[PDB]
Structure 1
Amino acid sequence: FSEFNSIVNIVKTHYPDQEYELMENYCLLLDPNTKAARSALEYADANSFNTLTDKLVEKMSIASNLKSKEYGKIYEIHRKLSRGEIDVLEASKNIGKYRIKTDEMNIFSKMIPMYDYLSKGNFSPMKSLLKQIDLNDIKENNYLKKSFETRIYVLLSNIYLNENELELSRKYAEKAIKSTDTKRFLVFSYLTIGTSYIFSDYALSKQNYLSGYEIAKGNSVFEEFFKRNLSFLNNFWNKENPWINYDSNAVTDVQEVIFELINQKKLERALTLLKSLERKKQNENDLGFHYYLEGLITNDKEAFYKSVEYFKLSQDKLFIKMPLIKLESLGENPRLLKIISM
């Protein structure tokens, strides 16, 4: 029996719209040396309540309870990495320096790099590690155990999507959904299921995005994810597109504007706007989409070759299909393009 888990369930079932405002207050009244305070740390981080997580870290880092101290220090490293105040190599260095006694943090330790490595495309080795983790080793905090189960299902889901293993990606996203009531995990699961259907099934892609958008309502960052993806979906399938953010200066938003312009056959303006994105505010995966859009306008195979290269560098075996399809249309060897997509 966990009193924390009992409170969360009461707040989720009876006051869902006030969840953050009730739980924030309650989490910050817990003594930092207690089991409940520890669970609160995972509850805060699993929900991406950043300011709460950081307030809990500040208290628990300097607590006298050894377990609390340990959770504090390891979540501290996680948070530093997630905010980008440090890089993964230093994160690992710091983990090494700390003597980890709990099964929970030993396992968490391993997951911390994975959030960074996943963000920038390294998949195969960490997959093996995730399947190796046995959460039955966590004997002393079933709330962490259940939360970590979800964390694993979501990571696996995301890995399998990027490997273009869409049956497996769905399997793990659905298992994540069944496993949790944490909004953030439901959001990412529905994003993943939605993205899995981008090429194969418009309606099912849309319907998984709308389910996720419903769950995301209230958090504007989570809302933005579905609107960006719904905007891509409609642009890709050449449908009327209500989801675009014309105001945003962010690269992924401006790309959706461009794609719409291409569909509207305003190719001159699409190019000038694409040409202004040439300032280096873009990761490899963003350059995939960039050179694909340029290709759609200019019909230059070079643009599509570059698009393939950037998708290959970022290890996106899903979106690499787009320029490959276009190169097939321009009469390039279908067998070689199939081999590039494996």
Structure 2
Amino acid sequence: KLKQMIKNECEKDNQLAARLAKLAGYEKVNGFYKFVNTPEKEMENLGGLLKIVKNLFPDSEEQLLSEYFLELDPNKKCARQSVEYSDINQWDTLTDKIIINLCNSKNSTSQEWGKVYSLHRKLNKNEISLNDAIRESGKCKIKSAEMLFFSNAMLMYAYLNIGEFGLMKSTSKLLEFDDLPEGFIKESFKSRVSMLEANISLNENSLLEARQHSNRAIENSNVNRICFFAYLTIGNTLIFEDYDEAKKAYIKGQKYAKNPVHQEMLDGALCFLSNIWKKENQWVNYNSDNIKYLQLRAFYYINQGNIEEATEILDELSSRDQDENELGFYYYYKGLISQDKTDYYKSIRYFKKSDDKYFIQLPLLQLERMGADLELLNLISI
């Protein structure tokens, strides 16, 4: 039991027991041990316990909490908190198990949370239509403020998945945080919306706004996923300004990457950065046929003059299903090889079609080096 494991760690270190008891709000370690040893069905709120678990077992919280959450009473608030914490961490297996428990519950609020998060997950897997999710959300007769919030906030992820940034923005304008009571759920939702708006701002080349939202997410959250994508976003906002500061933010994201997917995203960010600034690149991915990491490897080859290998990778990519943004990068690299302006023109057209107001400067800058009118280039960028 997680309860006894917390006490056993604290009994071996008096200062650790005192600081963790103080973090949970206790002056005496005995009341703290009683709190953490509360039977799972009798737990009232997860917030403090989640703080203790994250402080004590940072590398094993998914497993311990995977066992702990499944013992909560599905009819009560702790289980709903558990589904939100599980989903924000992207613990999909646990999240779906908890969703089943919440749906099979006798309590209407738990059933409502289970149905809304079930719709959220079906949208994540593209197993339901967005309008079908709106209608099904209408059939749930959503009563609680939280779910009234989340049944709308969840739409932002799908709109992001289809690149409908406008409908993201409008959706976020309907989110009234004042309708939410203070506590764990409201802070979690705050971190979510902070990250979403951070990526919205970065996509519009509003760097200060993106940094604001990212920093606020870091300040309100200790969830590894949130902080990882926050430092990833900050570093992304620094790509064309300062190599050392961008790299420093990226590296700050390292301690928050807990799976190889986020690790390869971070390595890819540093690989793109060092390719951009022609710095020492330790992050070339040689064990991937992912479109983006193949693109980054071809970029590295181009910088090192290995044009045949880069052109081989790009030839393989031409038969892959690259989306329009990936095609903007793709024709940027083809232009780096060919030095033909039409490739930079096509790169620009694909960055425009993907509504990317940030990385479109890649070909533009290259057009600027080749002696293009800087005013015309500035008109193209917007």
TM range (shorter): over 0.9
CA contact (8 A) 1:30 1:36 kept: yes
State the AA in 1 paired with 2:196: L
Separation in 2 of the partners of 1:161 and 1:253? 21
Partner of 1:181: 222
* Residue 166 (structure 1) aligned with residue 207 (structure 2): yes
Separation in 1 of the partners of 2:103 and 2:80? 11
* Residue 84 (structure 1) aligned with residue 126 (structure 2): yes
State the AA in 1 paired with 2:86: A
1:108-187 equivalent positions in 2, closer than 5 A: 108-139=150-181, 142-187=183-228
Partner of 2:54: 12
Q: Deviations over 1:285-320 (max 9, x none)?
A: 111111111111011222111111111121111111
Partner of 1:234: 274
Match of 1:61 among 90, 100, 103: 103
Match of 2:368 among 303, 328, 337: 328
Q: Which runs of 5+ in 1 are unaligned?
A: none
Instruction: Please give the root-mean-square deviation of Cα atoms over the aligned residues, in Å.
Output: 1.7
Identity of aligned residues (%): 42
Match of 2:322 among 274, 282, 307: 282
Range with bigger deviation, 190-199 or 127-136: 127-136
CA contact (8 A) 1:80 1:86 kept: yes
TM-score normalised by the chain length of structure 1: 0.95
Query: Structure 1 pair 165/278, CA: closer, same or farther in 2 (3 Å)?
Result: same
SS at match of 1:86: coil
1:300-319 equivalent positions in 2, closer than 5 A: 300-319=340-359
Match of 1:193 among 234, 244, 251: 234
- Deviating above 4 A after TM superposition, structure 1's stretches of 4 or more consecutive aligned residues are none
- Shift in Å, 1:132: 4.4
Q: Deviations over 1:74-105 (max 9, x none)?
A: 11111111123234343333323332212111
- Shift in Å, 1:272: 2.3
- Shift in Å, 1:238: 1.1
* Residue 42 (structure 1) aligned with residue 84 (structure 2): yes
* Residue 32 (structure 1) aligned with residue 50 (structure 2): no
Match of 1:75 among 113, 117, 131: 117
State the AA in 1 paired with 2:305: K
Higher relative contact order (CA 8 A, sep 6+): 1
SS at match of 1:85: coil
Q: Deviations over 1:217-267 (max 9, x none)?
A: x32222221111011111111122111111101101111110011001112
SS at match of 1:84: coil
CA contact (8 A) 2:159 2:167 kept: no
Q: Deviations over 1:96-146 (max 9, x none)?
A: 33322121112111122211222342224432442442222123x722111
State the AA in 1 paired with 2:306: K
The number of residues matched between the two structures is: 340
Separation in 1 of the partners of 2:165 and 2:185? 24
Separation in 1 of the partners of 2:72 and 2:92? 18
* Residue 219 (structure 1) aligned with residue 253 (structure 2): no
Range with bigger deviation, 57-66 or 176-185: 57-66
